[model samples]
Target: GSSGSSGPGSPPGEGAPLAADVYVGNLPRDARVSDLKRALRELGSVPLRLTWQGPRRRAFLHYPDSAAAQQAVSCLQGLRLGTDTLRVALARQQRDK
Candidate 1:
């Protein structure tokens, strides 16, 4: 029958799930994972994964779900980190290796 044709096991077409990752840039040169960890927890809770690129002065925070990512974006966008302000937003598709 057609009853189970369009259930939750749908393919990856339109209306895909929200991205659970956030890209934060413009971090202070001296920014550390400890600082980000504490700050993230203060905003909500620790993310599922955190990738700190100290040399690049940026980081990618991966949360368990979109809700956590959204919360982090809302709470950390434009937040001061040392002498620089943070740029927080949903991560775009990675273009490079």
Candidate 2:
């Protein structure tokens, strides 16, 4: 066995892959979770979990997988929220090397 071989709990490509989460940006300053949930529901396929960054005027919507996330992006991209058109896309997960 090589000394440099991967340990029991190796880094990088060991664990399950990251899900294709959706990113929602350009939110109104006063956007609320209730309002966001309503809008998303109307757009179709509500998020499994929502991470809202009020100061950043952005949010992250977690889905079951990439397919669901892509569907959400398609449905919600260019959606009007207040005076802003929402920006929706896939969220990239950073892993330690």
Candidate 3:
């Protein structure tokens, strides 16, 4: 019957759950995970999954929830991190996930 169709199931034309990952660039050369966490905590306690992609100066941080993550991103974007302004936003992975 139609009653069971509305249960906890994926909607039409949908894929797996999308992850909430954020990209934070333009950090100081000495920037560390602890530093990012401390700076970000001022906004909220969003899960910060940090990864040093290439160099030690930059990194990619993943958040469990996009809403919380976006909040930090909006506030921290263009804001100072160490000696330079931070570049923060939702990562492309979340969209393609």
lDDT of 1 by residue, 1-97 (tens): 4554554552232465678888888877687878888877877757878899988988888888777677667777767777766787788785668
Better of 2 and 3 by TM-score: 2
Screening candidate 2 with a backbone cut-off below 3 angstroms (N, C-alpha, C), the clashing residue pairs are none
Give the Å error, residue 51, model 3. 2.3
Give the distance in Å from residue 12's predicted Cα in candidate 2 to where it truly belongs: 23
Candidate 3 lDDT over residue span 1-97, tens digit each: 3554455642232363554677777778766777777766775745646776436566666776766666666676766765677777667653443
Better of 1 and 2 by lDDT: 1
Q: Candidate order by lDDT, highest to lowest?
A: 1, 2, 3
Clashes per candidate, residues 3 or more apart or on different chains? 0, 0, 0
Pairs that clash in candidate 3? none
Off by over 4 Å in 2: 1-18, 93-97
Mark the regions of model 3 whose C-alpha exceeds 4 Å error after superposition: 1-17, 52-54, 93-97
**TM-score on alpha carbons, each prediction:** 0.71, 0.69, 0.59
Tens digit of lDDT per residue, candidate 2, span 1-97? 6576655641232255656678778788788877888878877868778888877888889888776777777778777777887777776667779
Q: Rank the candidates by TM-score, best first.
A: 1, 2, 3
Superpose all Cα atoms of candidate 3 onto the true structure and report the RMSD in Å to 1 decimal: 10.4
lDDT of every predicted structure (CA atoms) = 0.76, 0.75, 0.65
15 Cα displacement, candidate 2 (Å): 15
